Amino acid sequence: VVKDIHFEGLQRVAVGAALLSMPVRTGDTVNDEDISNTIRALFATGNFEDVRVLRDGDTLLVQVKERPTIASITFSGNKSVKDDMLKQNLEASGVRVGESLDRTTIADIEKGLEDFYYSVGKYSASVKAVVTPLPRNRVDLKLVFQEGVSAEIQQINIVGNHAFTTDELISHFQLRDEVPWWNVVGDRKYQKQKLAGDLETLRSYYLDRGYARFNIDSTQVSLTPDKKGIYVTVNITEGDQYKLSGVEVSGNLAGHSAEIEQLTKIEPGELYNGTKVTKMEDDIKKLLGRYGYAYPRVQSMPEINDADKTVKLRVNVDAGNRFYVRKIRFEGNDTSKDAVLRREMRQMEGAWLGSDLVDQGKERLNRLGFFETVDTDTQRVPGSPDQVDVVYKVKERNTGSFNFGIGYGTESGVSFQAGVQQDNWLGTGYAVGINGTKNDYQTYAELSVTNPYFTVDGVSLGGRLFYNDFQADDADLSDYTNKSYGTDVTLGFPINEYNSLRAGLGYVHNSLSNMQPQVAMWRYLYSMGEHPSTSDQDNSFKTDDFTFNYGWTYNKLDRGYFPTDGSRVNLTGKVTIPGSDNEYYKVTLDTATYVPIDDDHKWVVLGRTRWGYGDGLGGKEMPFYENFYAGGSSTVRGFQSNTIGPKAVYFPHQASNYDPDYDYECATQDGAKDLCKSDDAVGGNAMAVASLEFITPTPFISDKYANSVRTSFFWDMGTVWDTNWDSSQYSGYPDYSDPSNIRMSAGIALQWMSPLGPLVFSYAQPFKKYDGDKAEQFQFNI
Amino acid sequence: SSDSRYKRQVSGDEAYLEAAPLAELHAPAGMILPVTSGDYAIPVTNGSGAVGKALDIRPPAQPLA
Amino acid sequence: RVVYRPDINQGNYLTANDVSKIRVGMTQQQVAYALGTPLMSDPFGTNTWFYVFRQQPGHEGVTQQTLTLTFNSSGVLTNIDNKPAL
């Protein structure tokens, strides 16, 4: 019998607390059964345990020594897997970190870890830990583990394959037989379930063919214990094709026979094809889709008839129920104008059910891009026979657009130039863009503000304006004295639900003074009739321009910031009005499309192009700023600002209101003084730019996210020129009147959009010979 | 999370005292309506103590040994 | 003035049989199944109920089949009427 039961070193449990938590206590005879009872109670703890019980005489020294807590938190050596998944493979396997960690368990668990690596299908040469017992009771293992992967060393086999060659099939597959890296589109790496898929892949295949009598196939997956004998083998048992003739109906529903029998319109004598009935079945499902019946059920059952090779059909269409929608609850609108989120809802909550419409809701939502989660999940009232509510979880993404620049110039004050365009602004559904260049000689303005919504009819409205003191002056004059006071405002109404034809209004003034030595100015002037001087820059002009703006647009953008398989339009045109100060006409087209070569769409290709054309109404023409520029942009890359186009000429101008000596060279009083071919891009009244890309998230980048990075390579073709052009004066100088001046660049474009930080790296090689190419091979956008 | 601000006031307005207490509907004879059907039920026996964001919001500490 | 107008409609789909089916006294669950567990009700006040049917195409015409319904506390079909198409 015991008289003393002593404990020491528990730190959380008392001597009496331990003595009573164990059902053995003092004053009772401790036999071997009581010893084993103390031990099984130590086992019955569940997070900590130590088997030390001694009895010599009348004393129980139960040495409950706390070698825990070991928080083996250190995962060192990860190369393809996630340390969390390792903790999980421990915890679920029964190695959770509330742990005793017997010295034996060290190697045991290392080896179990490695075994799991292999269960993935792989290898791991080592799992080593550095034991870190910290000097109260706590330990951790600096788990250092090295990997041994072997991924795709395929050999492929199927037998029974006797209506089509193995490889013809093999094509379609997630799992393929060792084809060159340049052949990769999507994903191919093994796993047991990749197999399962492939299996289905072909199962489905057969069933679509219309050969009913296959199912049978075994599980022969050749394995050599050299990590490379990774080899396939399968059997099959094919079926029987028939011809489509014969059906029977059981419409278990409110009654819509006519619509369906006309839907289910198959001619007797057709050939049997499981796809055609896949069609008809879904046809009916959605022919009800408006009718609300939330949960029908069907089994179109075929009756294969031999001695005539016929298939009868047999369907059974029990319906759902009529009117459900109760509440329209969404989830994710942290600081969102969910009000707008409901503005998307043209729907009527509190009514019957139309599937098409709930689709429309969710999908046109995600049309608004900008947010990444599909959701049309419909759970009905717990406690009422009908009456669903569809929830909507999207994962949003933010908007922010803020240009930055300090300085930088020596002869210039610290410039304060910013392009600030915050759209559908966080507090509104409504968008704004403002741009101003304040750099030591320019007060350049721009206003762009919109409301997409004055009506439920959806009308978009926006004012567009500027007041430009872009002087470009040396000090004050003979130096492009210009004041451009220009405006416009926007309205919006598409009715094809996807097609808009536009019409908008605006105004511009421009003040002109202090001409520059470029003849084309004079050309516009004289074509207008005004005859200015030519050795002198003496002339000054104004305009007041009452602008109408009609256009067209179509849109199908299948994601947001990284939209997919897009088909988008923006057409525009201009004609002059009664009572303004300028006359001309223009027409232009634009076209860019996505094409995803991947169907996981981890790889998408693009086709992009644009257009441009300017011409004058009677006797008059298209002013200059209206002409097309290009270079170093998301129209052309590899160059400097507005580089693509013709170039300009100076006429002998040695007194241009002090034609500045040592300045404004090439027919300046100091330098050249006669006719001058001058070097400066000018652009033309006609343009078009076409390119191609390929969305390409490389394996080398940690492809943990598909949202901040889209990676592609560009091709380009470039030439900008004037139409109403002659050589009669462009004889002694280069001539620009037809598309012949081809340009090209090639280069990589990197994109990783951090919420607040862009690092737009894109090196490009302009590779197409044309004169005056003033190149720039480092372009950082924002 | 602060710019020399935000110690004994919430981020933005507080309508705690501004919260409309029961401006009861006093129904005409037989013109009554179910007066409550949700959890929105407070013991009017409360306080008056730490009212509004001006209170001992710091975690009550607990004795040492 | 838009040359065309879309169409908007609300629940309670009804037909001539949907209405000719039910009859006086016919209880809550009876007419419920017969027509649907409706939504056009009285929360406070008598046991009176309604069926209306509204459908509006392209600036033209109107559907309003406003069926009034009345039960008692226990619930008995009584004192019912519709004005189809207003």
Partner: protein, 370 residues
């Protein structure tokens, strides 16, 4: 990338002492073309007439004479599903004289009797032709690692004795060869499942098992094993899946008792004189003694090929790299002097007609003699 592994590879060819320096090399090749396609096929010294082939639907009866190409035939069909219908070849090699009964890993089997001419009735069975074909008492023997074990007739075939043993999900590479005796044959297995058919209905007088295989306790990838046991005197000695010495001795029927020792690659016996290589690629000797051993070895671990041969009282072993490692009057000396190919070698070596036989990982034959 995936070739960044620092496992311990072939330990090098040792000192090259050979008073017997490889004294012939009669070379000859189909030039094909074996490649990394894994199997064990082999030229067959049929009356010193070696009927040889390669993995393209090739065959030509050379002669173990310096090998003169006779009976040269191509092996494919050109109608139907494809032109030449690409034949890939991993069905074992055997004859009965001219009766070269051969299968293809295309589950397609050819009892070509190059004795009655081009009589090779094709054969499309459950499971593919994977093992080397045997004949028991005038009946073709069948081990497809199919789980199902068919049987057929010579020169006509008819499905029979079609036994269905155990397959695992993993579907490892294992197959097995039947060792005929006592009105039955002795084939190996892959899950330790050792239930050996007395071909009576195809009747296993058997259900005992080697408790050892992979599939649940997957362990190291170096226990590659010859799954084929061998009759002696009524005793059969076996090579269980993972490292297992054993004698579950058939005693007119089966009397089982495991004399364990790990590290299995492949073996040979001479009465008591048991010889073998360990699964780490090291070579011991032994006697039928419960697992009492001989011949310590440490230096040729992880060599490419470890498939041995002896004739004229001098053992021989080779890896790939065309290196040849010679053995002997056995120890004190085991040393290695040759590197005879670059294609290298990975199959069974054979020593027939007082000669020696082996295929090069590509290109047919370079007949080295001591």
């Amino acid at each position: 990338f995936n070739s960044e592994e620092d496992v311990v590879k072939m330990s090098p060819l040792p000192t090259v002492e050979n008073q017997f320096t490889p004294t012939t090399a009669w070379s000859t090749s189909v030039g094909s073309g074996i490649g990394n396609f894994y199997s064990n096929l082999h030229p067959a010294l049929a009356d010193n007439v070696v009927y040889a082939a390669d993995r393209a639907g090739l065959v030509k009866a050379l002669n173990a004479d310096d090998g003169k190409e006779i009976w040269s035939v191509s092996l494919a069909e050109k109608d139907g599903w494809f032109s030449k219908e690409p034949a890939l070849l991993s069905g074992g090699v055997t004859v009965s004289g001219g009766h070269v009964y051969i299968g293809s890993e295309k589950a397609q089997v050819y009892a070509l009797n190059t004795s009655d001419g081009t009589v090779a009735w094709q054969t499309k069975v459950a499971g593919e032709a994977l093992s080397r074909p045997v004949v028991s008492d005038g009946l073709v023997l069948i081990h497809t690692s199919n789980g199902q074990l068919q049987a057929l007739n010579e020169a006509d075939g008819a499905v029979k004795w079609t036994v269905n043993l155990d397959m695992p999900s993993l579907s490892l590479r294992g197959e097995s060869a039947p060792t005929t005796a006592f009105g039955a044959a002795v084939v190996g297995g892959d899950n330790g499942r050792v239930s050996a058919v007395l071909m009576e209905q195809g009747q296993m007088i058997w259900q005992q098992r080697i408790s050892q295989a992979t599939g649940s306790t997957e362990i190291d990838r170096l226990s590659d094993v010859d799954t084929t046991p061998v009759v002696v005197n009524g005793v059969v000695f076996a090579l269980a899946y993972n490292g297992n010495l054993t004698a579950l001795d058939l005693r007119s029927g089966q009397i089982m008792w495991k004399r364990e020792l790990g590290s299995v690659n492949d073996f040979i016996v001479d009465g008591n004189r048991i010889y073998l290589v360990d699964q780490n690629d090291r070579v011991m000797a032994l006697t039928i003694d419960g697992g009492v051993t001989l011949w310590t070895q440490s230096d040729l671990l992880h060599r490419l090929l470890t498939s041995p041969v002896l004739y004229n009282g001098n053992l021989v072993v080779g890896d790939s790299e065309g290196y040849l490692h010679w053995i002997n009057v056995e120890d004190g000396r085991f040393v290695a002097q040759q590197k005879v190919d670059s294609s290298g070698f990975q199959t069974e070596p054979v020593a027939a007609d007082g000669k020696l036989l082996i295929q090069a990982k590509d290109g047919t034959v370079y007949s080295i003699t001591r």
